[PDB]
Amino acid sequence: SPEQAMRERSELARKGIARAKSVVALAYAGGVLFVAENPSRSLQKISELYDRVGFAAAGKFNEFDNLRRGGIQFADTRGYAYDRRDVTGRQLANVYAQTLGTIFTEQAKPYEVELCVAEVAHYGETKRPELYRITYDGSIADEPHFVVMGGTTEPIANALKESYAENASLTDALRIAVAALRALGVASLEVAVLDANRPRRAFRRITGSALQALL
């Protein structure tokens, strides 16, 4: 049935998205902060996409890593074909939406993934951080403050709703994000930033002892 597919595929992928760890991304003074609950040391759910565009995901690792790789491919081919400052978070988000829609309608099984594409302004420039959430069907949503992906999103989203503060420093945004995520030590957290102050490459991981000091 046309109705059966849409209702059944939707349930199969929303299940697999709630059947995974939780990631949050939020805006703070220096850019955007990604905080994910990740036990492994080799498998990662946060990644650089382009100079100022970062990426977080929640679901089935092989698939959102497939999307991670595709997005990297896309961004670099554009940046070389035109220029670096022409690739924007908006284009990337749009490509992920088209691709997840095509997958959701044409492939056998829908990608049980949830994506968040983040963008900050260039160096010495002024502009608000942009967060986009792309869901398994191709839907794309523009978020002003924070995105929560995977697992049970309600309690984390509400805790962030009470604790969020614009222009919070890096340490406060880390405390808020870890607290709302609990609703975990350096051995179970994947933390990275899109630091708007870096000259070119904005993405920067915060691991080990530096992460220890921040939290």
């Binding site: 829609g101 309608t105 069907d137 839907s139």
Partner: peptide, 5 residues
């Protein structure tokens, strides 16, 4: 797929 503009 709830993406209708």
């Amino acid at each position: 797929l709830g993406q209708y503009l």
